Each structure stands twice: as structure tokens, then as C-alpha cells.
Amino acid sequence: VDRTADLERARLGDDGLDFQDDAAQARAFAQGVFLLEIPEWLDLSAGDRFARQFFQGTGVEPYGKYRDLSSEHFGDELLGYHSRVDQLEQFLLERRFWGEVYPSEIATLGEHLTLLSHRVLRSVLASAGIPEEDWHRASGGCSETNGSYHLTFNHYRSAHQDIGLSSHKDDGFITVLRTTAQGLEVNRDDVWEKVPVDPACFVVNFGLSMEILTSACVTPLSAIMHRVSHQNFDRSSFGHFSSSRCLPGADDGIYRYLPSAGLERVCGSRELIEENDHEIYM
């Protein structure tokens, strides 16, 4: 693909998300993807280094050892190191383990991104016309700080003859993606387009839970279809993912908002992730 998407750029300011104007904000939310300026005080260098190292094993300091932590170590099949069928290999960790398992500076990064994402999500919920007292249940806790949050590190193995990462929608409400190299593509309006590279911005997009939640609103919001093209050289990235609380045995559920009525349950949060990962990776 040779077309490059023209995305709207936003900033977090005194009143929440600031786009250039109300029309720009509407286009961004209608597309389900936009750029978000990275706060100047926020240090991403340890996260960038973790994404470059996590897969390399205990010979490589300080982060290569996370290659050896599989899902078995967490009692949760979703977490730890995972080789995917595509070029991608990942390390995924939910917030309840960050303080104990991640390096301290990586847990700190995760916490910063959680509070940034929280602020982004609340701006979106307000634009959707959902009553504020329904936000906590509608977002499975992400309208406050009680959601499930995964800080997930990605490395694309260019020696594998696969697509980088198959076409998919994310599971949750908000993904804050840190990417510094080409490869991410988005499908708005049934044409694949490259996401412009800008290491001064995150890429923000909505997941399936945002789409389900707002599907009956006057302006439904989409979970952007996106992929990573086959990489001829290595690539890395990381993202902060916000989902309805999906702990084993403590699942907040996924809801659709019915204007003038309230929230109706659609499915489980973990169930949605499992069904989505099935539909993606085959």
C-alpha cells in the first residue's frame, strides 16, 4: 500500500482532549484512530529498550530475561511471553503484576500510561452522551482506575515469512500505541493506508469494547481495523491496552449503551478477548 492516512492530532490539555476544532474531533472519533502528542515530561526510553530486548533471553541486560516468563508463571494464559503465528512475538502483562514482576521503571511507565489513557477515555465517554453515573459499569472500571490494563511489548521477527501482525481490531476500549517505525496500516473506508510515523505522538485507537458500547448511539464509534505489514528488517513497539476488568473469576462484563434506557450486557471481557484472539491468529 502506498497511501498514507491523514490522521487528526490531539493533545491532552486543561479540559481533556484538545483537537484543532470540533469537526476534527468528530472525524477522529468517527475514524477510531488519531495521533496524541506525548507529554514532554514522559520518558519512553526504558519502554523502547524493553521492546527491543524482552525476547532475547537472560544473556541480555537488563530486560532479555523476560523471554523466560511464560503464561504458566501467572496463572493466566494471556500473560507472559508469547510467540505468535505472524512475525510478532509479545510480552503481555496486566497491571496487577506490574509492581511485582516488571522492572520498577517499566511499572512506572505503565502507571503514567494508565492515567493518560483514563483521561483520554473520559473525554470520549463525554462525547458519546452516556450519563456519567453509568461510566464505571459501561467501561468495566476504565472510566476510573479499576479496569484491566495490559502493558504489552511487541517485536517483529523479520526472518519469519509471515505478515507482521494480521488484520484485527483490539479487544478493549482504548489502546495507546507507542510506535517509532513504519509498518502499521489502517483500514478506514475499505482501503488500507499507512499510519504516518511520528515518534512525538502516540497512536490512539478504539477497540471492540468501544464499538460495542457505542453501537446504538447517534454517532457510533468504530474499532479501527489495523495490521502490521511484513517486515524486512526487525521492528518493535509497545502499547497500553485498557479493557473491562477481566481477571480470572472477577470479570466486569461488556455492555452496550441503550440511549434513554441504560446498559445491557453483551458478553464477558475475557470471553471477548478469547473470541477475538481466535478470530485474529486464525
Q: Can residue 163 be called a binding residue for Cl ion (CB under 5 A)?
A: no
Q: Can residue 8 be called a binding residue for ligand AKG (CB under 6 A)?
A: no
Q: Can residue 280 be called a binding residue for ligand 5NF (CB under 6 A)?
A: yes
Query: Residue 171: which of ligand 5NF, Cl ion, Fe ion, none does it interact with, CB under 5 to 8 A by kind?
Result: ligand 5NF
Cell for 253? 462484563
Provide the minimum distance between the beta carbon of 239 and Cl ion in the complex, in angstroms, as a whole number: 17
Q: Can residue 81 be called a binding residue for ligand 5NF (CB under 6 A)?
A: no
Residues near Fe ion, by CB under 5 A: 170
DSSP secondary structure, 161-175, as one string:
-S-SEEEE--SSSEE
Which 5-24 residues touch Cl ion, going by CB under 5 A? 12
* Interface stretch with ligand AKG, choices 7-15, 77-85, 134-142, 176-184 (CB under 6 A): 176-184
Sequence-ordered list of residues with C-beta below 8 angstroms from that of 73, at least 6 positions apart, any chain: 80
Tell me the HSE value of 233 on the side-chain side, using a 13 A CA sphere.
3
CB nearer to ligand AKG: pick between 130 and 195: 195
Provide the minimum distance between the beta carbon of 221 and ligand 5NF in the complex, in angstroms, as a whole number: 17
Q: Is the dihedral of CA 92, 117, 3, 127 positive or negative?
A: positive
Provide the minimum distance between the beta carbon of 80 and ligand AKG in the complex, in angstroms, as a whole number: 15
How many CB atoms within 10 Å of residue 18? 16
Provide the minimum distance between the beta carbon of 183 and Cl ion in the complex, in angstroms, as a whole number: 4
Q: How far apart are CA 186 and CA 168, in angstroms?
A: 10
Q: Can residue 184 be called a binding residue for ligand AKG (CB under 6 A)?
A: yes
Q: Quick one: which of 53, 143, 152, 237 contacts ligand 5NF (CB under 6 A)?
A: 152
Burial zone of 68 (CB within 10 Å; 0-12 exposed, 13-18 middle, 19+ buried): exposed
What number of chain residues touch ligand 5NF (CB under 6 A)? 13
Helix, strand, coil shares of the chain, percent, nearest 5, are 30, 30, 40
> Strands 9-13 and 33-37: what pairing?
parallel
Determine which helix (DSSP H) or strand (DSSP E) holds 28, and give its type and residue range.
Answer: helix 22-31
Q: Quick one: which of 7, 35, 38, 78 contacts ligand 5NF (CB under 6 A)?
A: 78
Q: Quick one: which of 171, 185, 193, 251 contacts ligand 5NF (CB under 6 A)?
A: 171
Identify which of 206, 209, 204, 208 has the alpha carbon closest to the alpha carbon of residue 252: 209
Interaction site with ligand 5NF (CB under 6 A): 78, 92, 150, 152, 168, 170-172, 241, 243, 273, 277, 280
Interface positions with Cl ion (CB under 5 A): 12, 182-183
